[PDB]
Each structure stands twice: as C-alpha cells, then as structure tokens.
A paper describes a structure:
Co-translational targeting of chloroplast-encoded cargo proteins is carried out by cpSRP54 alone, whereas the post-translational cpSRP transport pathway is mediated by cpSRP54 in complex with [name], a 43-kDa protein that is unique to chloroplasts.
To characterize changes in the conformation and dynamics of CD3 on ligand binding, we also determined the structure of the unliganded CD3 domain by X-ray crystallography and NMR. In the crystal structure, the CD3 fold is stabilized by helix swapping between crystallographic neighbours emphasizing the high flexibility of isolated chromodomains.
Residue numbers in the entry:
A (entry chain A), B (entry chain A), C (entry chain A), D (entry chain A), E (entry chain A), F (entry chain A), ...: 319 to 368
C-alpha cells in the first residue's frame, strides 16, 4: 500500500480521452512498521493531525 | 520526461566557454500515471496553482 | 543506526492486538560521518537546535 | 563533487578523540549539468540567493 | 506487496530468543503494473520459470 | 523513455478481466546521455549485442 | 550495520600517504529484519553458504 | 567522479548530427572511501582484476 505526496504532471491516456495525472509516491523503501512503543508520541501526534 | 526541482551548482563546460548549472531532478521512480478518478481533488488543485 | 522523519501509516499487527505505525526513515545512503572541521558551523548549529 | 543538506548525527571517531558529525548529502543521482539556456531564469535566481 | 531477493544478515531479536534474518527486498520504486500486451513475451516466459 | 529489466509479479486488473504483470524498470536516475566519444567502445559493443 | 558489495575505486587520502578504496555498500533501504518463519528456507540456505 | 556500468540506449543529439548513448552509472550513494585496512583483501583482489 502507498500514500501520495503530490501531483507533478498531466497528460492524456492511450485511449485518447481520459485525463491522467502524474502522481509522486512516498518511497516504501526506508519505511518500516514498528510497534506503538518504539515511536515517539510527537511523530504520532503529528500523524493524527495530517 | 522530467521536471526540475532546483539548481545546486554552477560550472564551466568542456568548451571552456559555456556556463552550466547543476539541475536536481525529481525522481521518476516512485511516480506513476493514474486516471483522474484515482487522485484526490486536493492534490490536483495544488498542481493547478503550481 | 537511524533517525525517524515522520509517521505515514497506522495498522494492526499480526497478533491482532498491537498497534503499529508506519515509520519513514532517513536514507543512510547519501550519508557519511565526517570530522568536525569538514562541516560548516551553521549546519552544526542547526543540528544543536533540532 | 557534492553539497551538504544538513547534520543528523554526532559521534566520537575511532581514535577515541575526534568529534564526527553525520552529514546528509544531496543525491548526485537525479542530477545533471545543463547549459544556461535549458534552465529557467527563476531556479537560477533562487540559486544565486542560496 | 513485495518479493524477496536474498538474505544478508542474521541476529537475535529483542525478546532475546527468536532468530531474525536481514531480508533484502526488491524496490517497489521503479516498478509498475502493466497490461499483458505492453510486455514482451520473453520477460513473461522468464517469469514463468522463476 | 524507459527499458524493462524483468517481470516480478502477476495479477488481475481493476476490470476483473485483464492480466497485469509487475514490471521492474531500470532507474533513469544514475543515467545520462553522453556523446559517442565519452563512452568506451566496449560498453557500446556490448549494447549492440543486447 | 552494513555489508560490502565490491570495490570500485582507489585513491590517496588527505594525509597524502594512506591508500583508500571506494567501497560500494548494499542499501539498507529495502531491507528489514524478519523472524525465521517468515523467510523461505532456500534464501537462508544460500546465506549460510555465502 | 563516477564509473560506468553499461549502455542502455542510443539516440541523436540536439544538433541533429552527433550520436549519444545512454549511460547507466553506479550510484555514488551507498559508496564511501575507506582506508586499506578496513577492506577485505578479497574485494580488493577482485578490483585489481576488474
Ligand atoms: Mg524505493
Ligand atoms: Mg530513480
Ligand atoms: Mg538507501
Ligand atoms: Mg544516488
């Protein structure tokens, strides 16, 4: 699964009709799942605001 | 195709005359084209302002 | 060793109980240890505030 | 050649005396040298302020 | 979802009992899903052998 | 533009019919276009065989 | 901690005496520690030969 | 400074005459200079053959 950063492009697809946007994704490299105790409350509290 | 982030360098080329700048590019890794429905209006509306 | 950037996810672990957060890490690629003289005072003074 | 982003660490070296800082570097991947005409004046004018 | 390349490490976990291996993963950056027609039969036939 | 390395996955698309393969791409980071003189004949001769 | 792939360079250090080699490291991005059950015996058996 | 892996492309430059090849470079990320003692003789002996 992944989360989108921003949009950096716009084009027309192969069908010649549909509009496609170029989506920048957060790298899932340099990303791990860790138990709630290993993380600092701060970063979590910032995630909750998002 | 690619989009430029910023300039982080300045030098003289091999001809000994022309000025070259060092351009940082957005990685086209972690980037996909997706149909207009898969994207959130927000990120698009931010792209339109750019 | 590594340093955490932010939290970009939340899930339940394999035990079906514990809460896990998805932690983005700074890449340790593009990172070297250098003696105190090679670094500019500025970047250090910014690190001290962190 | 390379340019430093920030400092994200501090340690003591192998000699047991000297202080070392952990320097994050801009990736020189996703970076090319391009002639002054290919670049937008804007990004250059931002580089000049740096 | 992800696919494992190889094992490059071995350690003992935080419980002090369980054995953990360090798994190298294929980057899911530089990876896209594409319809069967866009791909060459060859690469597919190589995948089928895997 | 890009060049395919291998196939590392297989799935069914959103339409519920079409077969999609997961294509690993060569990173276009760490890649530059250079004049024929800057390159060694060898690497070129290897490209010609491909 | 890290593991070395190969050597791709050779130079003289800042002291003007010592010989330094340029070491390519496996990225610790795209690498996680996982319990012995999550890994396939094969990859482990290949690690043991190393 | 950098070292070339292979050639993965061929095109005509902007002048409309010169032939350009697309060169894949080893990432200088995940690469450090280390004293001759920190490296294993093996990897060095493999570098000498190159
Ligand atoms: Mg990645
Ligand atoms: Mg890339
Ligand atoms: Mg890395
Ligand atoms: Mg790099």
């Amino acid at each position: 699964y992944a989360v989108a950063e921003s949009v950096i492009g716009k084009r027309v697809g192969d069908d010649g009709k549909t509009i496609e946007y170029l989506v920048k994704w957060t790298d899932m490299s340099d990303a791990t799942w860790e138990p709630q105790d290993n993380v600092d409350s701060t970063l979590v509290l910032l995630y909750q605001q998002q």
